[PDB]
Amino acid sequence: VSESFVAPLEKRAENDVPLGNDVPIIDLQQDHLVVVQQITKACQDFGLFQVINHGLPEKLMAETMDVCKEFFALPAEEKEKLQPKGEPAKFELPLEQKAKLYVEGEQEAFLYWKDTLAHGCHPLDEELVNSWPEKPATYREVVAKYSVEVRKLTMRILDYICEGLGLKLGYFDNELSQIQMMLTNYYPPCPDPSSTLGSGGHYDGNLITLLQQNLPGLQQLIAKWIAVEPIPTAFVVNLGLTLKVITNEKFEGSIHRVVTNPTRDRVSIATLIGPDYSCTIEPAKELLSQDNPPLYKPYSYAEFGEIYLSDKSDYDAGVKPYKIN
Ligand SMILES: CN1[C@@H]2C[C@@H](OC(=O)[C@H](CO)c3ccccc3)C[C@H]1[C@@H]1O[C@@H]12
Ligand SMILES: [Fe+2]
Ligand SMILES: [Sr+2]
Numbered sequence: 022v023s024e025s026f027v028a029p030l031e032k033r034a035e036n037d038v039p040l041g042n043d044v045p046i047i048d049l050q051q052d053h054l055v056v057v058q059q060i061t062k063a064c065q066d067f068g069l070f071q072v073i074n075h076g077l078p079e080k081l082m083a084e085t086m087d088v089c090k091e092f093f094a095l096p097a098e099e100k101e102k103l104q105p106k107g108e109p110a111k112f113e114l115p116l117e118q119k120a121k122l123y124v125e126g127e128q129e130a131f132l133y134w135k136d137t138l139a140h141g142c143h144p145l146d147e148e149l150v151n152s153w154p155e156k157p158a159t160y161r162e163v164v165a166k167y168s169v170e171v172r173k174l175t176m177r178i179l180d181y182i183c184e185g186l187g188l189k190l191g192y193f194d195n196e197l198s199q200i201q202m203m204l205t206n207y208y209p210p211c212p213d214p215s216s217t218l219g220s221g222g223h224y225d226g227n228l229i230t231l232l233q234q235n236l237p238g239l240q241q242l243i244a245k246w247i248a249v250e251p252i253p254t255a256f257v258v259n260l261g262l263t264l265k266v267i268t269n270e271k272f273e274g275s276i277h278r279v280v281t282n283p284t285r286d287r288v289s290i291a292t293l294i295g296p297d298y299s300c301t302i303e304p305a306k307e308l309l310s311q312d313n314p315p316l317y318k319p320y321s322y323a324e325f326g327e328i329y330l331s332d333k334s335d336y337d338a339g340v341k342p343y344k345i346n
């Protein structure tokens with residue numbers, strides 16, 4: 022492969038990462054309190070779990086994966102229409118909600134073996150959807166329905182989390198969940214998987230992420246890496262760095278990466294929900310005491326975002342400047 026994609030030695034993936042047998046798989050059609058308790062335990066101990074019987078239509082999950090795969094099968098001439106000034110966009114602020122193709126990497130500078138389609142999804146209006154891909158013809162109809170359903174499920178999970186923490190229901194149903202970025206990630210086959218990464222190890226910087234996958238490649242850091250079993254009808258829930266801060270580290274964030282495959286391509290669909298760039302992030306005051314003093318000072322989400330997107334020297338580089346006590 023091109024030297025551009027060669028990861029530094031220490032960041033390269035080992036060839037035989039074991040299945041995470043202890044990744045919680047949570048049935049949302051259990052009794053209400055059982056769901057609250059199992060979600061709370063997974064958030065406290067792991068920061069990554071799967072949800073099944075989650076109420077989002079399996080047909081809609083299949084139709085969305087279909088139209089996302091159809092998008093990445095489009096010819097160059099169509100994909101150029103989402104490359105500002107002839108090039109993929111960068112994950113840097115301002116992060117606009119109009120649809121673009123994105124390149125990603127670390128600055129021993131290297132690129133991730135990944136093409137990403139990203140756009141905002143909330144609130145859904147004519148202007149936003151008109152900024153989405155024109156092809157395939159059904160993308161806008163399908164992804165509009167998908168985005169509304171994934172948000173519905175994410176807000177249910179956040180309210181289970183509220184009940185587990187002892188926060189009032191709807192605590193996150195405000196500026197803290199105003200941004201909904203849908204990242205469709207395309208990992209083409211890689212001739213040298215031993216040297217490349219689909220994505221380096223990271224927390225998602227936002228509040229919470231729901232991830233739809235049907236093929237292997239997602240791994241979690243627990244410093245042992247484990248493989249997250251693809252369940253095509255499930256969502257992987259990744260707790261974000263923002264939720265780690267707001268819970269005053271009562272909850273773990275998900276540190277995850279994606280490895281490349283030499284033979285087959287992979288598409289994943291990540292719905293990243295989190296604060297507006299104008300938000301102030303701090304540990305929830307309702308949970309603080311002399312026994313539980315704040316571990317972070319209040320900070321600008323915009324200021325955090327700039328560091329999070331640029332500085333990859335450590336997983337929590339984004340929040341290091343705001344650590345106290
Ligand atoms: C692999 N990268 C990581 C970093 C990057 O994430 C983002 O762009 C999110 C989008 O809301 C973001 C969160 C907080 C602040 C700013 C930006 C793109 C992908 C994704 O998995 C994360
Ligand atoms: Fe991620
Ligand atoms: Sr180009």
Ligand SMILES: [Sr+2]
Nearest residue numbers: 150151152153
């Ligand atoms: Sr347009």
